[PDB]
Write a protein that binds this ligand. Sequence first.
Ligand SMILES: N=C(N)c1ccc(Oc2ccc(-c3nc4cc(C(=N)N)ccc4[nH]3)cc2)cc1
Ligand SMILES: N=C(N)c1ccc(Oc2ccc(-c3nc4cc(C(=N)N)ccc4[nH]3)cc2)cc1
Lengths: 255, 255
Amino acid sequence: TWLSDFPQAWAETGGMGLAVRQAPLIIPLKATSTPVSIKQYPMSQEARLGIKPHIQRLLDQGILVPCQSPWNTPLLPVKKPGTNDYRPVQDLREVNKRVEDIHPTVPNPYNLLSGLPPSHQWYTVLDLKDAFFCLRLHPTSQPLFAFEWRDPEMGISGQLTWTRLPQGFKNSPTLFDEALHRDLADFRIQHPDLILLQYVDDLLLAATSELDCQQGTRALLQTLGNLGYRASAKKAQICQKQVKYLGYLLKEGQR
Amino acid sequence: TWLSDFPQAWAETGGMGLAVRQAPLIIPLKATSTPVSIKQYPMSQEARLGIKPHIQRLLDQGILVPCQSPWNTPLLPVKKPGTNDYRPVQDLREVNKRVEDIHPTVPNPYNLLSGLPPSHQWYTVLDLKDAFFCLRLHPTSQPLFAFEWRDPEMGISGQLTWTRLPQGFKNSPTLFDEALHRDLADFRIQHPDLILLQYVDDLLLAATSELDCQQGTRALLQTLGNLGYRASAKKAQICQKQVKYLGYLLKEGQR
DNA sequence: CTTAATTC
DNA sequence: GAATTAAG
DNA sequence: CTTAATTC
DNA sequence: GAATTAAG
Ligand SMILES: N=C(N)c1ccc(Oc2ccc(-c3nc4cc(C(=N)N)ccc4[nH]3)cc2)cc1
Ligand SMILES: N=C(N)c1ccc(Oc2ccc(-c3nc4cc(C(=N)N)ccc4[nH]3)cc2)cc1
């Protein structure tokens, strides 16, 4: 009943996340950067109809808000199979080129796993849902990610932008990893005998016994829920001696 | 009257050369080499008519002789401007690949000229005509360079081959340089105060005074003539303080 | 005429 | 990978 | 739809 | 240099 014991921690039962302890992020631009406004390539009705539901959902969630900005980047008619799942994909390359670089602090999977001791063979893997959207963007940095949205049948005035850390932004993974690391520092301190590996939104908790893993997982879920993050209950691998993490299969202390 | 004083040394007055002091060359094959017989691509009448005179001249000079050989390489319809000067060009690449490698002892022009002292500013440049043809090929190595020659109007049976070091053979330049160096060793010994640079068939004699250059050039021409080599009287640059050698212009001690 | 390398 | 060179 | 890289 | 990839 992991699902029922922690209603707030699961994305399926706790509503959209919001890292309440994290201050809205301010995105520094390179010293010579000036806003760039790239025109939106005309989108076909089919692509527009596919994307529409997502845009409305995000507007309802307050993740997207109307705005007028000197910045503008293109939205793409992206999918995968044939012409389904039209999730909106923003081409933020011209924005990324004007944003100041930050040190890449997210360790590569290989080195991250090196920190997994043979002594801890009871694992719990969790992946946070819509992780980036949990981090607020400071109002001053919001205009930077604006894009155009039109509804030929009288819909929206013009531009919309993100109030949360967006997908496609070059520093989103790193900024999210650093945050969360900050939010989970106390948990690590409260559970010295537990191993916690973090790779952006993918978490691995390792314990020496099934009990400790159970007690540790309870604590982690409780903490994540309270902080405003949400884990996928569907994909959760709880207290297993064999789990799939970052492309590896952890078994018998191997990999 | 350099031309009249040394009839035997100039190609224009001494007949074809023949290095009488040099033993016929034997060309060692790689340890696993076996003869290769490449078919002659059909040659058009125009190409055949252009090449014909050269082949006959060489046969008359004994430089080319009939033969039957398990080796055979192609003759090419080579020219330059449009369809003139049809000098025979043999593709000896499959023969070169089967001949044992030798150390490249011919110095590059740059290093060779480094041996030209500022003290010697009176130059004489000579280039030997048909240098390679002056070196005899041992009968045992002759079959290696065979090619096909036909005269639709009943001319030659089949193959012809060289009795002299041929053009297109990978070791001809080096073998010629080494020979000649051997033939001119005494001259260097008899003229210690003279500088003699050799680059295959291109010679540069350098002296400190116009007189020494005159006396030295006389001696060199006499020696070359007696040994069986022939210098181009037309291109000869005699006792000049400015001469063109190996692409460089030697002047005021420069280059 | 082939063939090995260099460009685009 | 189809032109373009360079060279025997 | 772009755009930067990789192949052939 | 024209395809083919990969990715925002
Ligand atoms: N596809 C196209 N339109 C074009 C393709 C190629 C182009 O240029 C060039 C093609 C070939 C060379 C070039 N080729 C060689 C071959 C050499 C050898 N191995 N003998 C030795 C040196 C050398 N230089 C130099 C430049 C220009 C245009
Ligand atoms: N001319 C032709 N018929 C062909 C041309 C190209 C062919 O293959 C390939 C083409 C392109 C790739 C390839 N392209 C990329 C682009 C990358 C990027 N910068 N996002 C990152 C990694 C990557 N791999 C790999 C193989 C096959 C056939």
